[PDB]
Design a protein around this ligand. Structure first.
Ligand SMILES: NC(=O)c1ccc[n+]([C@@H]2O[C@H](COP(=O)([O-])OP(=O)(O)OC[C@H]3O[C@@H](n4cnc5c(N)ncnc54)[C@H](OP(=O)(O)O)[C@@H]3O)[C@@H](O)[C@H]2O)c1
Ligand SMILES: NC(=O)c1ccc[n+]([C@@H]2O[C@H](COP(=O)([O-])OP(=O)(O)OC[C@H]3O[C@@H](n4cnc5c(N)ncnc54)[C@H](OP(=O)(O)O)[C@@H]3O)[C@@H](O)[C@H]2O)c1
Ligand SMILES: N[C@@H](Cc1ccc(O)cc1)C(=O)O
Ligand SMILES: N[C@@H](Cc1ccc(O)cc1)C(=O)O
Ligand SMILES: [Cl-]
Ligand SMILES: [Cl-]
Ligand SMILES: [Mg+2]
Ligand SMILES: [Mg+2]
Ligand SMILES: [Mg+2]
Ligand SMILES: [Mg+2]
Ligand SMILES: [Mg+2]
Ligand SMILES: [Mg+2]
Ligand SMILES: [Mg+2]
Ligand SMILES: [Mg+2]
Lengths: 293, 293
C-alpha cells in the first residue's frame, strides 16, 4: 500500500496526529518520522505510537523524507521552512495543512530550495480539540481538501498529493491561494470570529448570570460555544494572516446585521419571514450533499 | 401513572407532538385530546396515533380538560386564549411552551377567566425540525424547563406543572417573565438571529459560489446553517414579541464586534488571544454540566 518511503510530520496535534493514524491504518509510508517542538508533546506521540522515528529537530526529521507535512499554527510556517530548507533532499514534496494559504506560501516559499516541490494544502475537516490525543483515524473521510499549487509547480508532485488525500478519504479541489482565502473567510473564519464574539458578549453580562447561560444553553448558545472552545493560538494566527479577506466579510456581515436590526426595531415581520425562509435552502443543500454533522 | 384525567394539546408540531409521545409513554393522561388548525396536520397526528380524541375546534378540545397545553407560534397565543376562554372548566390549568413569555402572558391573560390557573412554561429543548413527524419521546430528558407564574398564581397548580415536567425528564426553575425574556434573548434569540444573518451574508456573495459554500461547510459554517433552517414563522414571531430584550443584546453584540474588528485591523494578536482564551471556560462548564450536544 505504500505511497511514500518516508513521511516526516512536523507538528503532531489534531491534524498531524490524525494524518499519522491514517498513514498507519492504510500502510501509506515505509517510515513515519514525527517531530514537534516540545519534549512533552513528543513523548505523548511516542506513547501513542504515532511514529517510527522521533526527534526534536525538524531539520533532522526531514533528512531523506519524500513527503514533509507541516501541521503547525500558520504564524509558525516561515520558521519551520527556514529550519528545514537546507536539509531537504532533492525532489522532496513539502506540504502543509494551514487554515490560510496566501500567507503560508509567502512565508515559506522564499526559504525553500528550487529542487523541492511545494504543494500547499488545507483539509476541510476538524474538531474543537487539540494535541496528539485529540486525533483519530477517519477524520478526513468524506471531507474536502483544497490544494493551492503555485503556477509552475511539478504536476507529478501535485498528483501524488492528490492521491494521498484521496487515500485518506477526501475529495480534492485545486484553486488559487487568494480565492482560497476569500472562500475560507466566509465558510470558516467569519463563523469562528462571530462565535467568539457572541460567547464573549454573554460572559460580560451582569443581569444574566454565568450559571443561567450554562443551564439554558441548549436553546441555541451551546452550538457557538463549541467553536469558541477551539485553540486560541490557531485562531489568533488565522485572524493575523487572513486579515484582508476577513475584514471584507466582517463588513458585509455587519451591513446585513444593521438591516436585520432595523427590521426588528420597526416590526417588519414580512422582511424577517423572507430572510428566514431564504436561509433554509442552504441547509437543505448541505444535508443532501452529506456535509452535515 | 396518571397525573391528569384529560390533557388537551393545542398545537401538535415539534413540541406538542413530543409532549404527546411522552404522555403516552409515561401513561400520564387518562385521555389525550389533540387539536390543530389544519385538517392536514390533524390527519397526520391521527395516523401517528398521537391522541385519543381529535378535533379542529380548540373550543371543543378544552371541554372538561384538566390541563391545556398551548404549543403554537407565540404570535398566535392571544387568538387561542380568546377561542378557548368560555369553554374551560373551573380549575383547569392552562400552560404554554412559547419561546417568549412576557408577550404570551399579556396576550393570553386578559381572555382567561378568574377560575382557571394560568402557568406559563418554556421547555429549553428542541431541534430545527417542525411538525408532528419531527417530534419524539425523550426530547425533554436532561433539559431545563422554565415556569413563569404571575404573582398570586395557585401554588398547587404550579406544583402539578412542575411535577409534569419533571416526569418528562426535565429540571424545573421558576422566574419572573421579564427576567426570562432577558435570559432567553442572549442564550437563544441572539444566537438564532446571528446564525440567520451569517447564512444570509454568504448567500449574497458573487465571488464565492453557492457550490463552494456547501462543499466546504465543515470548516464551521454548517453549525450556523442548522439553526438557520428552523421554522420562519416561529422565529419571525420571537423577534416581534421579544423586541426590547433582543435589541439590547444586539447592541451589546455589535459594540463587541466593532472592538474585535479593530483588533483584527490593527493586528493586535495579544487582544485576540485573550478573547479566545476567555471563551473556552464557558464551553468547559457546559460540558461538565452535560448540556453539550
Ligand atoms: N483544528 C482544526 O480543526 C484544523 C483543521 C484544518 C486545518 N487546521 C490547521 O492545521 C494546523 C495545525 O492545527 P492543529 O489543530 O493540528 O493544532 P494543535 O492540535 O494545536 O497542534 C499544534 C502543533 O504545532 C506545534 N506548534 C505550535 N506552535 C509552534 C511553533 N511556534 N513552532 C513550531 N511548532 C509549533 C505543536 O507542538 P507542541 O505541542 O510541541 O508545542 C503541535 O505539534 C494549523 O495551521 C491549523 O490552522 C486545523
Ligand atoms: N422548535 C423548538 O425548538 C421550540 C422549543 C421550545 C419552544 N418552542 C416554542 O413552541 C411553540 C411551538 O413550536 P413548534 O416548534 O412545536 O412549532 P411547529 O412544529 O411549527 O408546530 C406549530 C403548531 O402550531 C400550529 N399553528 C401555527 N400557526 C398557528 C396559528 N396562527 N394559530 C393556531 N395554530 C397555529 C400548527 O398547526 P398547523 O400545522 O395545523 O397549521 C402546529 O400545530 C412556539 O411558541 C415555539 O416558540 C419551540
Ligand atoms: N475545527 C472546526 C473545523 C475546521 C476545519 C478546517 C479549518 O481550517 C478550521 C476549522 C470544527 O470543529 O468545526
Ligand atoms: N430549536 C433549537 C433549540 C431551542 C430550544 C428552545 C427554544 O425556545 C428555541 C430553540 C435547536 O434546535 O437547537
Ligand atoms: Cl517515495
Ligand atoms: Cl385531573
Ligand atoms: Mg541546519
Ligand atoms: Mg538542498
Ligand atoms: Mg535561504
Ligand atoms: Mg449585504
Ligand atoms: Mg365559543
Ligand atoms: Mg367559564
Ligand atoms: Mg373576554
Ligand atoms: Mg461589550
Amino acid at each position: 500500500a505504500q505511497q511514500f518511503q518516508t513521511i516526516a510530520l512536523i507538528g503532531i496535534g489534531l491534524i498531524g496526529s490524525s494524518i499519522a493514524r491514517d498513514i498507519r491504518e492504510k500502510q501509506l509510508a515505509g517510515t513515519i518520522v514525527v517531530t514537534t517542538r516540545s519534549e512533552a508533546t513528543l513523548k505523548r506521540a511516542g506513547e501513542l505510537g504515532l511514529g517510527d522515528r522521533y526527534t526534536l529537530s525538524a531539520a533532522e526529521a526531514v533528512e531523506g523524507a519524500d513527503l514533509v507535512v507541516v501541521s503547525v499554527p500558520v504564524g509558525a510556517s516561515g520558521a519551520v521552512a527556514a529550519e528545514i530548507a537546507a536539509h531537504l533532499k532533492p525532489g522532496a514534496i513539502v506540504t502543509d495543512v494551514g487554515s490560510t494559504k496566501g500567507s503560508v506560501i509567502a512565508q515559506m516559499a522564499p526559504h525553500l530550495p528550487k529542487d523541492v516541490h511545494f504543494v500547499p494544502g488545507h483539509p476541510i475537516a476538524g474538531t474543537e480539540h487539540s494535541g496528539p490525543d485529540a486525533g483519530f483515524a477517519g477524520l478526513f473521510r468524506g471531507r474536502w481538501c483544497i490544494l493551492t499549487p503555485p503556477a509552475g509547480t511539478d504536476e507529478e508532485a501535485v498528483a501524488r498529493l492528490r492521491l494521498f488525500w484521496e487515500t485518506l478519504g477526501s475529495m480534492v479541489d485545486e484553486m488559487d491561494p487568494k480565492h482560497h482565502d476569500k472562500v475560507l473567510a466566509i465558510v470558516s473564519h467569519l463563523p469562528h470570529i462571530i462565535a467568539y464574539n457572541i460567547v464573549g458578549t454573554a460572559d460580560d453580562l451582569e443581569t444574566v448570570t454565568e450559571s443561567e447561560v450554562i443551564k439554558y444553553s441548549a436553546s441555541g448558545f451551546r452550538d457557538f460555544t463549541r467553536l469558541a472552545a477551539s485553540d486560541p493560538t490557531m485562531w489568533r494566527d488565522v485572524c493575523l494572516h487572513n486579515k484582508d479577506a476577513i475584514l471584507e466579510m466582517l463588513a458585509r456581515f455587519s451591513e446585513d446585521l444593521a438591516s436585520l436590526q432595523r427590521a426588528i426595531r420597526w416590526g417588519d415581520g414580512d422582511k424577517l419571514f423572507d430572510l428566514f425562509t431564504r436561509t433554509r435552502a442552504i441547509r437543505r443543500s448541505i444535508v443532501q450533499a452529506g456535509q452535515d454533522t
